[PDB]
Symmetry: C2
């Protein structure tokens, strides 16, 4: 498995765009690696089709996308035509799909599905998502099972939070949406906040402590 802040493995894999080396492919960019259990299955088709629908939202944010299952590249290419169809978007696939036929990555990344195996007994991946920073470190992960399709709007929401809080001394509260007020992080002194967050609100709480500090979302 991979924990937050670890350097993502600089793996070599085959894909729909040929062989790649992950750190080279990603470069100095934010990235999202996401897996699915099997090509030619229904939820998986809805998910990759949704990602096509959202490709511009990821592109606007400088976020490179890459898919993964344990199927082979020929199956990815054929199935990709079904994905395009369901997406309702015409044009070439906007992201590569990695072929993890040896299950090396499924195991390394702690992403084996609990229930779904091939008829021949081979493991398969779950519906994992890994958000990787330009420093190649894991910033956020989810592990959803085969039964449960993902919410890619939540993935966009957390990307917005991660990119903002990388740059500014804020953290995003429960259910934050871009443009909503943020919290000033505990490490910022009152003296520093005078300049940095001149409209900051310190909300009084029963403990009498001074940590509950809101500010408008900074420009970033």
């Amino acid at each position: 498995g991979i924990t937050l802040g670890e350097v993502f493995p600089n793996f070599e894999a085959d894909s729909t765009i040929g062989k790649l080396k992950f750190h080279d492919w990603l470069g100095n960019s934010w990235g999202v690696l996401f897996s699915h259990p099997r090509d030619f299955t229904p939820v998986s088709t809805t998910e990759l089709g949704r990602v096509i629908q959202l490709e511009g939202d990821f592109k606007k944010r400088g976020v490179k996308l890459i898919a993964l299952s344990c199927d082979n590249v020929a199956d990815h290419k054929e199935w990709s035509e079904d994905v395009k169809c369901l997406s309702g978007v015409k044009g070439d696939m906007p992201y590569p799909i990695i072929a993890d036929e040896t299950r090396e990555l499924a195991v390394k990344l702690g992403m084996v599905d609990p229930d779904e195996r091939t008829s021949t007994g081979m493991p398969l991946t779950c519906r994992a998502v890994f958000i990787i920073g330009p420093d190649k470190k894991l910033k956020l992960s989810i592990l959803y099972p085969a039964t449960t399709g993902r919410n890619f709007s939540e993935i966009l929401r957390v990307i917005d939070s991660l990119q903002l809080t990388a740059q500014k001394k804020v953290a995003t509260p429960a259910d934050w949406q871009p443009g909503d007020r943020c919290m000033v992080v505990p490490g910022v002194s009152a003296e520093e906040a005078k300049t940095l967050f001149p409209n900051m609100e310190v909300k009084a709480v029963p403990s009498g402590k001074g940590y509950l500090r809101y500010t408008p979302q900074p420009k970033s």
Copy 2:
């Protein structure tokens, strides 16, 4: 770390309700164990306050809630009054808070924060969520960092998916909400589907295969 379908550790820990052994505390119930980096911090307050606001939503689904940080129980109790205040909901805390001061749970569960440490240099937890079935197995997890508050509506959404898909031969598509059409799992034969899913629709795809099969939610 813990992978999906692993039996969750039957840990012994202190908490705001006293000593607990996790499997015994959970019993024959769905559960949601969720962590936060530190008591008396703002995002964390908003999150734990939001879970109080949602406690009725979790209860109606038969889901027990339990929180966790590496702080002590005295701090948990004191800070809980701030959480209650923020929540706008009067009354006793509706879930316990575990004290993981040894960091054994932080490390075992793969939930150490990448950035936040104590001033004394010690690890802290991130904003993890673990959804555990009645069989004590891990069904779904998320690992969010300290910087990024969670969406507990999404947690409710996936509970609904997990609970439905445990009982019926369906899987929930991208962005599914309760009431939306589901997908018939590949394993179900056309013949079985005549009975089980009489209003199933098969959508034609370029590959010509028959797997894109929708059904109203059972």
